Design an enzyme around this catalytic site. Structure first.
Site, short mmCIF file in Angstrom:
data_model
loop_
_atom_site.label_atom_id
_atom_site.label_comp_id
_atom_site.label_asym_id
_atom_site.label_seq_id
_atom_site.Cartn_x
_atom_site.Cartn_y
_atom_site.Cartn_z
N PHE A 168 30.20 -6.14 23.27
CA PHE A 168 30.93 -5.96 22.02
C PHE A 168 30.05 -5.24 21.00
O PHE A 168 28.90 -5.62 20.78
CB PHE A 168 31.40 -7.30 21.44
CG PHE A 168 32.54 -7.92 22.19
CD1 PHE A 168 32.34 -8.48 23.45
CD2 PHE A 168 33.80 -7.96 21.64
CE1 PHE A 168 33.39 -9.05 24.13
CE2 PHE A 168 34.85 -8.54 22.32
CZ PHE A 168 34.64 -9.08 23.57
N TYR A 186 35.62 -15.28 29.16
CA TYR A 186 36.78 -15.73 29.91
C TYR A 186 36.45 -16.33 31.27
O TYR A 186 37.33 -16.92 31.90
CB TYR A 186 37.77 -14.57 30.08
CG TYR A 186 38.04 -13.86 28.79
CD1 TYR A 186 38.91 -14.40 27.86
CD2 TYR A 186 37.42 -12.66 28.49
CE1 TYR A 186 39.16 -13.76 26.67
CE2 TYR A 186 37.66 -12.01 27.30
CZ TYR A 186 38.53 -12.57 26.40
OH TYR A 186 38.78 -11.94 25.21
N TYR A 246 35.33 -4.66 15.64
CA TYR A 246 34.71 -4.92 16.93
C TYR A 246 35.20 -3.89 17.93
O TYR A 246 36.32 -3.39 17.83
CB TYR A 246 35.01 -6.34 17.41
CG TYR A 246 36.42 -6.51 17.94
CD1 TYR A 246 37.49 -6.67 17.07
CD2 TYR A 246 36.67 -6.52 19.30
CE1 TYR A 246 38.77 -6.82 17.55
CE2 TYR A 246 37.95 -6.67 19.78
CZ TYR A 246 39.00 -6.82 18.90
OH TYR A 246 40.27 -6.98 19.38
N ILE A 293 36.06 -16.76 21.50
CA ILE A 293 35.27 -17.32 22.59
C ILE A 293 33.88 -17.67 22.05
O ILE A 293 33.38 -17.06 21.11
CB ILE A 293 35.19 -16.35 23.77
CG1 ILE A 293 36.57 -16.06 24.36
CG2 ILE A 293 34.39 -16.95 24.89
CD1 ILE A 293 37.28 -14.90 23.73
N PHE A 327 38.03 -1.32 26.49
CA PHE A 327 39.38 -1.86 26.65
C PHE A 327 40.08 -2.18 25.34
O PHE A 327 41.31 -2.11 25.29
CB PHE A 327 39.35 -3.11 27.53
CG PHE A 327 38.50 -4.23 26.99
CD1 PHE A 327 39.01 -5.12 26.06
CD2 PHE A 327 37.20 -4.39 27.42
CE1 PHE A 327 38.23 -6.14 25.57
CE2 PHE A 327 36.42 -5.42 26.93
CZ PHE A 327 36.94 -6.30 26.00
N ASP A 328 39.34 -2.51 24.28
CA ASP A 328 39.96 -2.84 23.01
C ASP A 328 38.97 -2.58 21.89
O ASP A 328 37.76 -2.61 22.09
CB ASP A 328 40.43 -4.30 22.97
CG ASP A 328 41.60 -4.51 22.04
OD1 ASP A 328 41.71 -3.77 21.04
OD2 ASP A 328 42.40 -5.43 22.29
C1 LIG Z 1 49.82 -12.45 19.81
C2 LIG Z 1 49.09 -13.66 20.21
C3 LIG Z 1 47.74 -13.55 20.87
C4 LIG Z 1 46.64 -13.40 19.83
C5 LIG Z 1 46.42 -11.95 19.59
C6 LIG Z 1 45.84 -11.44 18.34
C7 LIG Z 1 45.76 -12.32 17.14
C8 LIG Z 1 45.33 -10.02 18.28
C9 LIG Z 1 43.84 -9.97 18.60
C10 LIG Z 1 43.20 -8.72 18.02
C11 LIG Z 1 43.62 -10.05 20.11
C12 LIG Z 1 43.66 -8.69 20.79
O1 LIG Z 1 45.00 -8.27 20.93
C13 LIG Z 1 45.11 -6.87 20.83
C14 LIG Z 1 43.01 -8.76 22.17
O2 LIG Z 1 41.62 -8.84 21.99
C15 LIG Z 1 40.89 -8.66 23.18
O3 LIG Z 1 41.19 -7.35 23.73
C16 LIG Z 1 39.42 -8.74 22.82
O4 LIG Z 1 38.72 -7.55 22.53
C17 LIG Z 1 38.75 -9.96 22.76
O5 LIG Z 1 38.11 -10.47 23.91
N1 LIG Z 1 38.67 -10.66 21.63
C18 LIG Z 1 39.20 -10.10 20.38
C19 LIG Z 1 38.12 -10.15 19.32
C20 LIG Z 1 37.52 -11.54 19.21
C21 LIG Z 1 36.95 -11.99 20.55
C22 LIG Z 1 38.02 -11.97 21.63
C23 LIG Z 1 39.00 -13.08 21.36
O6 LIG Z 1 38.55 -14.32 20.87
O7 LIG Z 1 40.22 -12.93 21.57
C24 LIG Z 1 40.98 -14.11 21.39
C25 LIG Z 1 41.36 -14.65 22.74
C26 LIG Z 1 41.75 -13.72 23.84
C27 LIG Z 1 41.35 -16.09 23.00
C28 LIG Z 1 41.58 -16.61 24.39
C29 LIG Z 1 43.01 -17.10 24.52
C30 LIG Z 1 43.24 -17.62 25.93
C31 LIG Z 1 42.31 -18.78 26.22
O8 LIG Z 1 42.49 -19.20 27.55
C32 LIG Z 1 40.85 -18.38 26.02
O9 LIG Z 1 40.03 -19.51 26.16
C33 LIG Z 1 38.78 -19.17 26.70
C34 LIG Z 1 40.62 -17.77 24.65
C35 LIG Z 1 42.21 -13.76 20.56
C36 LIG Z 1 41.80 -13.13 19.24
C37 LIG Z 1 43.10 -14.97 20.29
O10 LIG Z 1 42.35 -15.91 19.56
C38 LIG Z 1 44.34 -14.59 19.49
C39 LIG Z 1 45.39 -14.00 20.40
O11 LIG Z 1 45.21 -14.03 21.79
C40 LIG Z 1 41.24 -9.72 24.21
C41 LIG Z 1 40.66 -9.36 25.57
C42 LIG Z 1 42.75 -9.91 24.34
C43 LIG Z 1 43.40 -9.99 22.97
O12 LIG Z 1 44.79 -10.09 23.13
C44 LIG Z 1 45.12 -11.37 23.62
#
Ligand SMILES: C=CC[C@@H]1/C=C(\C)C[C@H](C)C[C@H](OC)[C@H]2O[C@@](O)(C(=O)C(=O)N3CCCC[C@H]3C(=O)O[C@H](/C(C)=C/[C@@H]3CC[C@@H](O)[C@H](OC)C3)[C@H](C)[C@@H](O)CC1=O)[C@H](C)C[C@@H]2OC
Ligand SMILES: [Ca+2]
Ligand SMILES: [Ca+2]
Ligand SMILES: [Ca+2]
Ligand SMILES: [Ca+2]
Ligand SMILES: [Fe+3]
Ligand SMILES: [Zn+2]
Lengths: 800, 107
Positions: B99, B82, B26, B56, B36-37
């Protein structure tokens, strides 16, 4: 009589030594207390800022009243003027004004919760002003009158026996009654009345039905009815078999470390997640997630093992490790290689994660530790000023000179009176002492502040030699290992190099042989990979066509190393300006965010001063025109660039922007129309320039071809259509960023020119360390996931 | 608010199902084109499971509409992202995300 003569001489050396012990302890104890409050961002609070007001109020009394009060005792004279005499009692009776009123505000503040913020500031100012207004009577009446001892004229400060007004006459007669009333009766009544009411309110409805409610679930979750919850029984909920942090949270619940959780441990953990829970304790539960061994400190290997659980296989073992060292180094303010709770605050203070750790419970029952200090500070004050007021009352009621054995009674009183003064002074140096011994939170901060008083930033003496010429080997090796430089030295490199750029013309004269390089875009580890391909910068001339920042995570290393290389080789390294060296783009992209995280906001400003001085174009061996972008509709001859004013941020239109943004057409060399310039839809500004535009410009200036950058190429270069006049390719694009953005998987190229021979040398990408998005650390990265997971567990455990 | 634009077609016969794991690359960028990622920066894919809210709701819905091998551009409005809170340090509040995701394998 005969009693007071020996008593006064006995205490003459006793009183001065005690005031010295107060002075030494007071000046260091109270000052360190203030240093703790502002350095630690969790210590700010609202009840912890009034305590800082106590220390500041008492420090002023210590530095002014105590020294001169000592010199009264030893000299028995007043060598000072009248202005000083009205200052001695005014401040001494003012400081106890802050001490008395603050202890009243502190008592009211704590009952407020049970029943720097904006409403805190009014309390501090109102306390100080009200205290000073009531210290005025002392300042009015003190002056030097009415003593002459055996012909010796001595100056002694005292209260005036006759006052200007009858109001001060009333104050003079009942001075002890006013001191005993407003400074002893008023605080001890208010502090105790609210504490007595606080105890009654806390006692009622403390257990309530909540402990009965959680007891219903605790027996239910205990399948074997052993009175305690095991890990296996926590796995019995299907919703928790997929939560990665259940094993950690059970460790916090299991306080004694016996491996299993009983009822008292269960109730304590749930209280930490109440809606009324304070900020400072929810951050402590998150802190205890990473702190595996409960030693109070997060270590390098423990932070990695915790993260390895939640990350899973989404990252490598090396990549997850690399950000852990960087998180430790940037957040370690003590240099001990591990993170404490005070350092954990400075990272996640403003993340507002505590607002997510919420479940539906109450009765935090944490008001024990915080309120112990407030009642202890009042306890210290009461036991220090009690003897002094007790001596005066003894004089008022029991003393009568008509009694035959009058001397014996006065003997006991005058010994206690001198003791009462000594203990009253002790309260100015006792409040920090009590805090260090009572409260754990202040105790840990005091240990770090006093007893305790690669991550190494290179120092100016090391990067520069004695001649002021930076040493590239040291700077390269340190930067390549994630190392940084001092804040001052970072400014020094940028500013010193920028001056060299300031003297050099808009249109450069570059002679062969020379190496031409394209965009770098912050790819520092790809930048060193460039240097072996083209040759060492010491003996090989390089021309960079711009784009030193953005799109990468090591932009500052590219800037520092190139500007450092500019100083060491002003005449063999030539830097030109790209469209990313302006405030418009770095705000949009990550260069500014990089500078804030890596060095400071002040380094970013220094870069823009240097980025303004960057040349726009160069003339290569009198045949090739080197420019970041391309031609301009408003420039027809090379001297047009010479007349431009380059020491400014590029405008959104004009010749300079067209230089830094113009692109060749998609069908360059095969255009359907003969229009020279068209609007550039891809960039949003500047113009497209076509094949007729290039050939006319080359012929009009007697130029052979044009070298440019600013367009990504799969092979790192693109040889366009050859000019009909010369048979040579009219336009050349050089892109020296291998694996651009790590998604293109392209190659990079550098152009070697020597002996009229055109050479293209290619190279591929190199491994580089891993940075999180927006340069954040693992605590900001993971806490949104920690706060979500622990809440998911707690709601599944309780609510069911 | 989920929008899917096809970039490269897949097989068109295999779809992710509830209970199994999706393996994707992705590339997450804002509405303004700023990246950003991306998992390709890490050279490893991203593994998540359908139906357990590991991602999400916006990302999950788009991935279920993709075929094996398909690569498509997804739009994530704040209601299925978010939202007003954002993500501390990455996503500004109320930001719409784009994405670019490629489905490699399903287990
Ligand atoms: C170490 C522990 C943390 C653990 C980190 C990992 C396993 C590494 C994994 C590649 C995450 C990346 O780390 C480099 C980075 O990916 C982003 O850059 C991104 O592109 C993104 O949007 N993604 C990732 C791809 C799937 C969709 C989405 C996501 O579902 O992300 C999910 C997300 C943020 C859920 C939020 C959590 C907060 C709640 O409040 C909210 O509820 C609404 C939902 C991620 C996968 C979480 O499930 C798992 C984690 O957070 C985020 C912008 C920030 C995130 O880092 C945090
Ligand atoms: Ca059990
Ligand atoms: Ca236990
Ligand atoms: Ca530890
Ligand atoms: Ca430390
Ligand atoms: Fe570029
Ligand atoms: Zn550029």
């Amino acid at each position: 009589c005969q009693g007071p003569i020996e008593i006064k001489e006995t205490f003459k050396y006793i009183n001065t030594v005690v005031s010295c012990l107060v002075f030494v302890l007071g000046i260091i104890g109270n000052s360190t207390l203030l240093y703790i409050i502002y350095k630690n961002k969790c210590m700010r609070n609202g009840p912890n800022i009034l305590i800082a007001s106590l220390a500041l109020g008492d420090l002023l009394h210590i530095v002014i009243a105590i020294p001169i009060n000592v010199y009264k005792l030893l000299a028995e004279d007043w060598p000072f003027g009248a202005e000083m005499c009205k200052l001695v009692p005014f401040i001494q009776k003012a400081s106890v004004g802050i001490t008395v009123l603050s202890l009243c505000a502190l008592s009211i503040d704590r009952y407020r919760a049970v029943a720097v913020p904006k409403w805190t500031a009014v309390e501090i100012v109102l306390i100080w002003v009200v205290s000073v207004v009531l210290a005025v009577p002392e300042a009015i009446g003190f002056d030097i009158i009415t003593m002459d001892y055996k012909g010796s004229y001595l100056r002694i400060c005292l209260l005036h026996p006759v006052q200007k007004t009858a109001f001060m006459q009333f104050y003079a007669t009942a001075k002890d009654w006013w001191l005993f009333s407003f400074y002893f009766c008023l605080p001890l009544a208010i502090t105790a009345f609210f504490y007595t009411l606080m105890t009654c309110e806390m006692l009622r409805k403390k257990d309530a039905d909540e402990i009965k409610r959680l007891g219903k679930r605790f027996k239910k979750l205990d399948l074997d009815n052993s009175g305690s919850l095991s890990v296996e029984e926590f796995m019995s909920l299907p919703e928790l078999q997929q939560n990665p942090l259940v094993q950690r949270v059970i460790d916090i619940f299991d306080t004694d470390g016996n491996g299993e959780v009983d009822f008292k441990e269960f109730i304590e953990g749930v209280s930490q997640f109440s809606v009324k829970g304070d900020k400072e304790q929810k951050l402590r539960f998150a802190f205890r997630i990473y702190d595996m061994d409960k030693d109070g400190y997060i270590s390098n290997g423990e932070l990695f093992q915790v993260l390895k659980m939640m990350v899973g296989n989404n990252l490598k073992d090396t990549q997850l490790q690399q950000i852990v060292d960087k998180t430790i180094i940037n957040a370690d303010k003590d240099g001990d290689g591990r993170i404490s709770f005070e350092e954990f605050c400075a990272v996640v203070g403003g993340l507002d994660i505590h607002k997510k750790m919420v479940v539906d419970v109450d009765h935090l029952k944490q008001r024990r530790e915080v309120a112990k200090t407030v009642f202890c500070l009042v306890l210290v004050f009461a036991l220090c000023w009690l003897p002094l007021h007790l001596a005066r009352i003894l004089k008022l009621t029991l003393y009568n000179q008509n009694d035959p054995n009058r001397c014996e009674l006065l003997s006991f009183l005058l010994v206690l009176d001198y003791i009462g003064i000594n203990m009253a002074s002790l309260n100015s140096c006792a409040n920090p002492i009590a805090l260090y011994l009572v409260s754990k939170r202040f105790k840990n901060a005091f240990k770090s502040a006093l007893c305790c008083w690669p991550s190494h930033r290179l120092t100016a003496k090391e990067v520069f030699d004695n001649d002021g010429k930076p040493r590239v080997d040291i700077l390269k090796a340190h930067l390549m290992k994630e190392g940084r430089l001092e804040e001052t030295v970072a400014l020094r490199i940028i500013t010193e190099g920028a001056s060299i750029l300031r003297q050099e013309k808009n249109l450069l004269d570059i002679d062969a042989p020379v190496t031409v390089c394209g965009d770098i875009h912050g790819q520092f580890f790809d930048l060193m990979k460039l240097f072996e391909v083209g040759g060492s910068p010491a003996n090989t001339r390089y021309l960079f066509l711009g784009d030193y920042v953005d799109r990468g995570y090591f932009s500052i290393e590219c800037v520092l190393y190139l500007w450092a290389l500019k100083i060491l080789y002003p005449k063999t390294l030539f830097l030109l300006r790209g469209n990313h060296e302006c405030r418009h783009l770095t705000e949009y992209f990550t260069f500014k965010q990089e500078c804030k995280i890596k060095y400071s906001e002040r380094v970013y400003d220094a870069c823009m001063d240097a980025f303004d001085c960057l040349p726009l174009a160069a003339l290569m061996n009198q045949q090739f025109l080197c420019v970041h972008g391309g031609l301009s509709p408003e420039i027809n001859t090379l001297d047009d660039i010479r007349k431009l004013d380059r020491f400014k941020e590029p405008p959104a239109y004009g010749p300079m922007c067209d230089i830094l943004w113009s692109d060749p057409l998609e069908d360059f060399g095969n255009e359907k129309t003969q229009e020279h310039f068209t609007h550039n839809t891809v960039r949003g500004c500047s113009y497209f320039y076509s094949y007729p535009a290039v050939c006319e410009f080359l012929q009009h200036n007697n130029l052979l071809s044009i070298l440019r950058a600013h367009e990504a190429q799969d092979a790192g270069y693109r040889m366009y259509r050859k000019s009909q006049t010369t048979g040579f390719p009219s336009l050349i694009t050089i892109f020296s960023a291998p694996n651009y953005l790590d998604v293109y998987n392209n190659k990079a190229a550098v152009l070697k020119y020597e002996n009229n021979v055109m050479n293209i040398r290619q190279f591929n990408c190199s491994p580089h360390p891993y940075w999180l998005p927006n340069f954040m650390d693992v605590f900001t990265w993971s806490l949104p996931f920690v706060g979500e997971k622990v809440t998911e567990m707690l709601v599944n455990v309780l609510n069911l | 608010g989920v929008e899917i634009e096809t970039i490269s077609p897949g097989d068109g016969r295999t779809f992710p199902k509830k209970g199994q794991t999706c393996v994707v690359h992705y590339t997450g960028m804002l509405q303004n084109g700023k990246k950003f990622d991306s998992s390709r920066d890490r050279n490893k894919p991203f593994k998540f499971r359908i139906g357990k809210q590991e991602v999400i709701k916006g990302f999950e819905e788009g991935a279920a509409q993709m075929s094996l091998g398909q690569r498509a551009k997804l739009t994530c409005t704040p209601d299925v992202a978010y939202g007003a809170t954002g993500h501390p340090g990455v996503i500004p509040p109320n930001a719409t995300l784009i994405f670019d995701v490629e489905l490699l394998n399903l287990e």
